[PDB]
Structure formats: structure tokens, C-alpha cells
Symmetry: C6
Subunit: 134 residues, 6 copies
């Protein structure tokens, strides 16, 4: 599948997360005002972290960064965190991702992870609908 | 497929059942108030047992723990039990699962089981609709 | 595919027919009042015979035993019979199944049978709709 | 796919045509009043000829013998004929089938035939709709 | 896929074009008044040229010869021509087909051709809709 | 998939871009007034550049050159540019395409490119809807 982004300012950033349990950012894009980005989910990148004033658009609908298979998360407040399961018999929440207010995250479901856990107040969108932490 | 859970309290628990006739719980999660969980059905886990005050959401609709392919069961009362068939020529109800009032169960259909039998008063949801024991 | 049953009394029975031309019953279930059953069609069982006061539910709709791919039959009266073709060049109606008033039958289409013939007054449901013998 | 027939009298007949250019009838069924028949299209039988007072029902709708992929033909009058093409470079109308008023024909599309031609007044039904010779 | 034709006169003709860049007519059918034809698109025939007073019917709708994947063309006037691309690196319009007023053409997309060009005034129908040269 | 073009003048041009990171134009078509073109996306051509007064029609709708999976771009003004990502670990915007006011571009998603970036004011259409740079 694919997604669409639009920039409301200069400096809107994109971080690509390495696919797998070992997670780190390999890119730091910079988008000027009026930018529009189109991209896929690849074997190298199963998730994307968006930053800055931007508009994100996907199959589940259109999301705004400022307004108060795969899945969507929008951080309503600061300190928002996320956790990931390790597939297989060895079971534990491997990582504790972190996000700030207004940050957005998107990720597919990988052979390395079968479940996810979230912390902080945030909005969630899926192929089934939407879900708010409050 | 996938499912979504939301926690209304602290201590909402998740038990993963080992896939196959040999059934036992390999995990005991703990969810605080405001938790949200997303997970898949895996070769290691064909069924899930949910416990505590929570909201469960699936393709068949949205279910509440307190309000009075794969399938869904919601225990309306205490003493609710479930049974499973053994696939193949050797035919008999192998186990007698047990559930309490307000407990929820979800399970795929496995190569080890072709049919299921339920006891106690409960609610059932499927790709076809819903069914109440009363 | 799958089907759902509900019991209105004690003693609702289920007979599984051996897949193939050689047909006989390998099981005789007993369902108490309030029972609910879920099962698949398997290589070992291509058809099922239901007996007793029960409610049957499938993709073609919901059927009642008392009210006056695969296919559905409901015996409106006693003496209802069914016949099966033998696939291949050797062509003849191999068997003459029998059913009583209120009895229900369900069966897939197998490599052993390509056509079926019915006798007695009965109701039929398919992926296309419903059909009454009268 | 499949089809359904219902008999309005005794002696409703079914002829199965051998699949391929070499066409002849291998069966002559007899249906009493109130009969109902269900059958498939098989490698041995790509077409079926129906005779007598009967009701035929398919994905394209419900047809009556008396009222004035695969395809459907209903003979409105006597002398109705049909012709078949031979697939491959060798091209010619191999046969000239014949039908009487009220007769019905059904046939799949085979590796031996790519096109068909009809004569007499008749009604035609397809996955696209219906067509009358008049 | 398939198509349907109906004849409004005697002498309605059908020309089958050889599949590939080398195009010539291998057949010249003759249809009397009231004829109805059904045929497929085959490896031997990727396109068909229709001539005479007839009614053509396809998934894109119903067309009349007199009224003023694959694709459809209807010649509104005389001198209508069509051209075909040669697939691969070697690129040029290989042929210049010709059609008269009221003539109709149908063709699949082949490994030999990836694009087509038309000349004269004509009507076009596709899986997307219709298009008129005027 | 496919697309349709119509010419409003003489000299409407088509440029085919070589599939892959190495991009250059292999063809320069000329379309007279009233032209209509149909073509596919091929292994040799993953994108097409349209020039001149023309009407373009695709699954996402109908576009006009003058009015003020794969994707669509319409240059609203002069100086419009586009950029492409290089798939794999080696990550950078390889090229900076350029377009003038009224120019249109169409391209599939290739194994060589996973994302694209645009510059200038333009209109975008996708399987999800439309997007304007303003």
C-alpha cells in the first residue's frame, strides 16, 4: 500500500525505521512549505515517523498534525510511547518507542512483531475505523 | 486477521493459548487504565483469553465486557465452559474449557479442531452475525 | 465454510456421514436445551444429518426445524428420501437416503457425487435462493 | 457452477452431451411430478438438454418451459437448431443441433468450441442479460 | 471474455484477424436475418471485424451499427483507419487498418501491440466508459 | 492498467521514459486535432510525459490540460519539477524532473523507485482521490 503527505511549513521531517526488532532511523528528510510526498512500504522500511506541520492521507482517511496490513497512530500529547512484541516463543515487549504531541507514526505488521502496545494519549486509525485514547 | 482491545481499568489480562489440542496459557499480560492493544493470530497462538474491564473490537463489531476464519464468545454468567473436537477419525470432545461472567474468548479454526461446544450462558459473534444463548 | 446450530430441547442429535459413495454414520451427538454448535466441513465429513428440535443457521439464512459449495434440505413431511449420483462414466443413482418430517440435511459437493435427487416434500436452500417442493 | 430443475409432470427428461466435438446423449433421465434436480458441469458433461414440463433456475434467473462461463437457450418454436465452431486453425461449423418448441439447452465453453450459432426462434440468457430472437 | 451479435439482415459478415503484427482475415462468415452469434477471444483470434446490419452487445453496453482487457470502435463515417504499435524497443506504427461508415472493430491487447491509433470519426467504448471522436 | 488521451490540436506529443533510474525519452509522438490514443504501461515504459492541448482520461477521472499502482500529476504552473527515490539501502533523490505549465505526467511504481517528490504548483490524482498543491 501507499500513503500521502503534505507540508504546511519548512522542515517537515521523515524518519525511516529499519525493519525488524533492531530499530533506528536511517533518514531525516526536510520538506519545505507546500511539499507533497508519496512513498511505499518496503522490505527495508516497515514503518515511518513523521514530524513537523504536515497533512497525512491514507486509506483510513485524512489526518492533520495540528487538529486536536498497517495501522496509524497520532500523538495527542507529549510523552507518548509505543512498545513492540517479539514474534515466536520468546515473548516480551522488546522496545519502548517515544513520541511527542502532534507526532505521527505508521507501520506495517512484520514477521518480527505480532502485537504493539501504546502509551500516552493518542489517536488510532485502522482498516476497521478509528480509536481515541480518551 | 486482527483484533483491538481497550482497557477500562488496571490489571486487564491477556492469556495466549498454545495452538493445538494441548492447551495452556503461556502469557499473562497486565494492562493499565487507558491501554490499547493490537495483535495477530499466529501459528503459536490460535486463541486468546481476555480478562478484566476492557473493550474488545473486531470485524464482527464492538463488544463490551460489562454490558449485559474465527469466532467470538462472551460469557454472560459464571461457570461458562467450552469444548473442542479432535480432527480426524478419532472423534471426541477433548477438553472442557471454563470461563466466568464477563470473560471473553476468541479463537481461529485449527487443523487440530473442526468444531466446538459451549456451556453456560454467553453471547456469540461470527462473520454471519450474532447469537445469544438465551 | 461453516454452519451454526442451536438446541431447543435435550437430545438434539448430529450424525456425520462418511465422505464418499460408502455412506454411514460415525457419530451420534446429544445436545441439551440451550446448546450451540459450530463445525466445519472436513475431508472426513462432507455432509451432516441433524435431528431433534433445533435452530440451524447458515450463509443461505436461518432455518427452524418446527416451522412448516453446498446445499440445504429440510424435510417437510415423513418418508423424505434423497439419492446421489456416482461421478465418472459409470452413471447411476447409488443410494436412496431417507429422512423424516422436520429432519434437516446438509452436504458439500464431492468428487464422488456430481448430482443429487430428492423424494418427499421438503424445502431447499442454496447460494442462489430457496426452493419448496410444493 | 450449478443449476436447478423442477418437474411439473411425470417424464421430464435429461440428456447429457459428451464433452467435445463428438456429441451424443449418454443418459435419459425420467422425473416424476414434483421432482427437483441439482447437478454440476463436469469434464464428462459440458452441456445438458432438458425435456418436458419443468422449471429451470440458474444464476441468470428463473426460466419456465411453458411460458411464451456458460450460456442458456430456450426454444420458442419447433425446428430450433444450434451449431458449434471447432477451435483451432481448422475452422467450420461442425454440427447442427436441433431442438423443439419449449426445449431448453445449457452448455459451458469448451476447448473444442469457441463459438456457437443458433437457428429457429429462441430465448437466450447469459451473465450479461437476456436476448430474444424476435 | 465474450461478446454477442445479432443480425438485422442477410449477409452480416465476420472477419477474424490473425493474432500478431501480421494481420489478415482468415474467415468470412455470412449471417441471415435474425442470426445470433456468440464467440470468445482466442490465441488464434485477438480481434474481430464485423460488417453489415447487426446489433453488437458487450460488457461495455449495447451498440447498434445504424444509429448515428479489450476495447471497442464504431466507425461513424467512411475512411476510418486504425494503427498499431509494435511492442519492444523497436517502436513504430506498423499498420494502418481501414474501416467504413457503420463498421465495428473489437480487439484485445496482445504481446505484439501495446498501443493503438485511430483515424476517421468513430465511437469508442472501454471498461471505463465511452468516447466520441467529435 | 491503461489510459486514454484525446488531442485538441495538432502536435500533441508523447514522450516515453525508460524504466529505471536512468531516465530519457525514447519517442516523440505527434498527434493531429481529433486524435485518440490508447496504450499500456510496459516493462520498457513505466512513465509517460504528455505535451500539447489534449484530454487525458484514467481510472482516477478525466483531466484537461487547459483548465486551471500508478499516480497522476498535472503542472499548474511553469518550473514544476519532480524527484525520485532510489530503492534499497543507498538512499537519495536521484533526479530532478522538470515540467511546464499545463504539462502532465503519469508513472507506475517501479523496483527502482519507492517514493517521489514534486516541486512547483501542480494537481495530483491517485486511487484515493485528488490533491492540489495550493
Amino acid at each position: 500500500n501507499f500513503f500521502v503527505i503534505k507540508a504546511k511549513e519548512n522542515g517537515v521531517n521523515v524518519f525511516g525505521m529499519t525493519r525488524g526488532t533492531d530499530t533506528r532511523f536511517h533518514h531525516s528528510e526536510k520538506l519545505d512549505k507546500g511539499e507533497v510526498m508519496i512513498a511505499q512500504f518496503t522490505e527495508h522500511t516497515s514503518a515511518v515517523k513523521i514530524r513537523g506541520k504536515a497533512i497525512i492521507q491514507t486509506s483510513y482517511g485524512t489526518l492533520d498534525t495540528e487538529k486536536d496490513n498497517f495501522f496509524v497512530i497520532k500523538a495527542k500529547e507529549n510523552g507518548v510511547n509505543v512498545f513492540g512484541m517479539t514474534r515466536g516463543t520468546d515473548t516480551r515487549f522488546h522496545h519502548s518507542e517515544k513520541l511527542d504531541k502532534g507526532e505521527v507514526m505508521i507501520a506495517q505488521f512484520t514477521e518480527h512483531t505480532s502485537a504493539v502496545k501504546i502509551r500516552g494519549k493518542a489517536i488510532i486509525q485502522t482498516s476497521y475505523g478509528t480509536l481515541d485514547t480518551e
